């Protein structure tokens, strides 16, 4: 198993730029991994988003400097209209992504247990 709870990963979800996030357990399947292999991630930032991500869309987070290669490869690897599916980041989205980056670098400087304490979403 490539990742475990509290791992920081870049996650690619169709329709969004490559986004900092954390491996975490799904609130109602109480699992962080499964075979549909997928992993469950919380996306960092002010929106409390979460998703199941195929491992091929998951890259271990080292830091913001990985963003350019991720973005450029993903549009490089596209089978023309597929390459076009690579759209701009508005000012509002960029600030939301910059927020998520700031959380992810904080999280990366604590331990897995401190960042699990600080960043795990609270559910009903
Ligand atoms: Se990853 C990146 C870097 C710089 C500009 C745009 C992107 C990007 O991937 N944008 C994408 C890709 C797919 C859907 C939407 C969207 O931008 C919102």
UniProtKB/Swiss-Prot annotation:
What sequence ranges are listed for the domain PWWP? 5-63
Tissue specificity, per the record, is: Widely expressed. Predominantly expressed in thymus and testis.
Intracellular or extracellular location(s)? Nucleus; Chromosome
Q: Which sequence ranges are marked TM in the entry?
A: none
How does this protein assemble? Interacts with HDAC1. Interacts (via PHD-type zinc fingers 1, 2 and 3) with SALL1. Interacts (via PHD-type 1, 2 and 3) with SALL4. Interacts with NANOG. Interacts with OGT. Interacts (via HMG box) with NKX2-5.
**What function does the entry list?**
Histone methyltransferase which specifically dimethylates nucleosomal histone H3 at 'Lys-36' (H3K36me2). Also monomethylates nucleosomal histone H3 at 'Lys-36' (H3K36me) in vitro. Does not trimethylate nucleosomal histone H3 at 'Lys-36' (H3K36me3). However, specifically trimethylates histone H3 at 'Lys-36' (H3K36me3) at euchromatic regions in embryonic stem (ES) cells. By methylating histone H3 at 'Lys-36', involved in the regulation of gene transcription during various biological processes.
Q: Which family does it belong to?
A: Belongs to the class V-like SAM-binding methyltransferase superfamily. Histone-lysine methyltransferase family. SET2 subfamily.
Q: Which disease is it linked to?
A: Rauch-Steindl syndrome: An autosomal dominant disorder characterized by poor pre- and postnatal growth, facial dysmorphism, and variable developmental delay with delayed motor and speech acquisition and impaired intellectual. Other features may include hypotonia and behavioral abnormalities.
Q: What is this protein called?
A: Histone-lysine N-methyltransferase NSD2
Native species: Homo sapiens (Human)
What taxonomic classification does the UniProt entry list for its organism? Eukaryota, Metazoa, Chordata, Craniata, Vertebrata
From the UniProt record, report the name of the gene that encodes this protein: NSD2
Section of the entire sequence shown: 218 to 349 of 1365
